[PDB]
């Protein structure tokens, strides 16, 4: 029974799980786009979002610096977090990362995901795009919406 068990069991145990996520998070901050097994990227995505929130507290904040020190193994990333990533998202209240499933990797056919920090310099990922408004179904719904405006106005 695993009712309400939010966290996955990974690696060699609890401590190993955090270190596995920390290594993935450290790679994401440096590269801004990494690809790994889907479950691990999904497990790490929450920490990636929360790390940006600590970066918004500022480097002067002692608790935030302690968080960045632990979660960022490579210390040169800590300045990047507070001075690059955090200011980038100053306006946004969330949704810092986007996660997309990519084809299963050849060796073990593991389900794979790509996760990136929105706004990176890297070439854009081929995001899924909703159908054009000009399509037949959308045009029929656009006409319906316009009529409901006239009826509402009356």
């Amino acid at each position: 029974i695993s009712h309400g068990r939010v966290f996955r069991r990974m690696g060699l145990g609890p401590e190993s799980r955090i270190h596995l996520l920390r290594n993935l998070l450290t790679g994401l901050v440096r590269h801004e786009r990494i690809e790994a097994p889907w479950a691990r990227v999904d497990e790490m995505r929450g920490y990636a979002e929360k790390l940006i929130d600590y970066g918004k507290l500022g480097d002067t904040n002692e608790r935030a610096m302690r968080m960045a020190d632990f979660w960022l193994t490579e210390k040169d990333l800590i300045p990047k977090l507070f001075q690059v990533l955090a200011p980038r998202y100053k306006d946004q209240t969330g949704g810092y990362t986007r996660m997309l499933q990519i084809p299963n990797r050849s060796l073990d056919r593991a389900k794979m995901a790509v996760i990136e920090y929105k706004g990176n310099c890297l070439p854009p990922l081929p995001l899924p795009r909703r159908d054009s408004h000009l399509t037949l179904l959308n045009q029929l719904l656009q006409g319906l919406r316009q009529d409901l405006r006239q009826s509402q106005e009356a």
């Binding site: 029974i1 009712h3 408004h133 399509t135 179904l137 959308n138 719904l141 656009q142």
Partner: protein, 284 residues
């Protein structure tokens, strides 16, 4: 040939518009059933010994402590009635049963995830689709017109109710947890072995209604009911012999707030329930 879902082909502009459009109609469809007594209601008969009125579907909010004037504590389960309406009436002959049946629906759910046949049934009735639909065996004098809303004040404090729901699913369990256990040449049918535990319908009989919240349509019922919180439960008058023929003073066939009566207080209490704003009790 491929599969499709409702917003697969919708554009960014039309996803918010369609979501609003189908939500506004639902709110307007539930508001058009708020006056059943001026919409050609079926005959309203008086209660007679041997009558069986309909029940309702409620959602299990959770549990709370309740104290009585004798100084005892009681844990109750809060059951909230959400968008409960009568859906179908079947007479004795057609139902293949001694008693006629009234079909009642529970929580409102999205129309985009329901079968076409079910979507057509609700279209005729003029109500948003429900999550759960249950059948109640009623007498011919308790028939209620399909589409009539059912409220928590259909039950009153001091009454007993059977509550049926699916139990919390424990998955495949061993004999020790399932059955509490640590030679004719064959195993008997029915032998207790490991297998899927829980996730089956169970009934808790004879649970008294301590309190009713008319504003939020919440029934405070004694003890616990099967299933997880936020599950849908079937609430019905208790079938236990001691509680037979106590429906003489309960709303028959159901409670119509539209009807001509003084509006009920926000909360209805049982004589022995200590109300929140009452003075601190003394036992002298």
């Amino acid at each position: 040939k491929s599969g499709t879902w409702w917003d697969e082909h919708l554009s960014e502009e039309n996803v918010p518009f369609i979501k609003q459009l189908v939500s506004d109609e639902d709110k307007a469809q539930l508001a058009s059933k708020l006056c059943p007594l001026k919409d050609e209601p079926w005959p309203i008969h008086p209660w007679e010994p041997g009558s069986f009125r309909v029940g309702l579907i409620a959602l299990k909010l959770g549990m709370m402590p309740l104290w009585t004037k004798d100084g005892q504590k009681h844990v109750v389960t809060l059951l909230q009635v959400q968008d409960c309406h009568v859906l179908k009436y079947t007479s004795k002959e057609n139902c293949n049963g001694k008693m006629a049946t009234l079909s009642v629906g529970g929580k409102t759910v999205s129309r985009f995830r329901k079968a076409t046949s079910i979507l057509e049934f609700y279209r005729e009735l003029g109500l948003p689709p429900k999550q759960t639909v249950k059948i109640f065996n009623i007498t011919d004098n308790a028939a209620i017109k399909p589409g009539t809303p059912l409220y928590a004040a259909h039950f009153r404090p001091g009454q007993y109710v059977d509550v049926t729901a699916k139990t919390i699913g424990k998955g495949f369990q061993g004999v020790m947890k399932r059955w509490g256990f640590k030679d004719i040449g064959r195993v008997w049918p029915g032998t207790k072995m490991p297998g899927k535990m829980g996730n089956i319908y169970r009934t808790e009989y004879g649970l008294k209604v301590w309190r009713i919240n008319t504003k939020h349509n919440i029934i405070y019922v004694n003890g616990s009911v099967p299933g997880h919180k936020n599950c849908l439960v079937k609430v019905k008058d208790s079938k236990l012999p001691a509680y037979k023929d106590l429906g003489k003073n309960l709303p028959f066939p159901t409670y119509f707030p539209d009807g001509d009566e003084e509006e009920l207080p926000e909360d209805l209490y049982d004589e022995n329930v200590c109300q929140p704003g009452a003075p601190s009790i003394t036992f002298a």
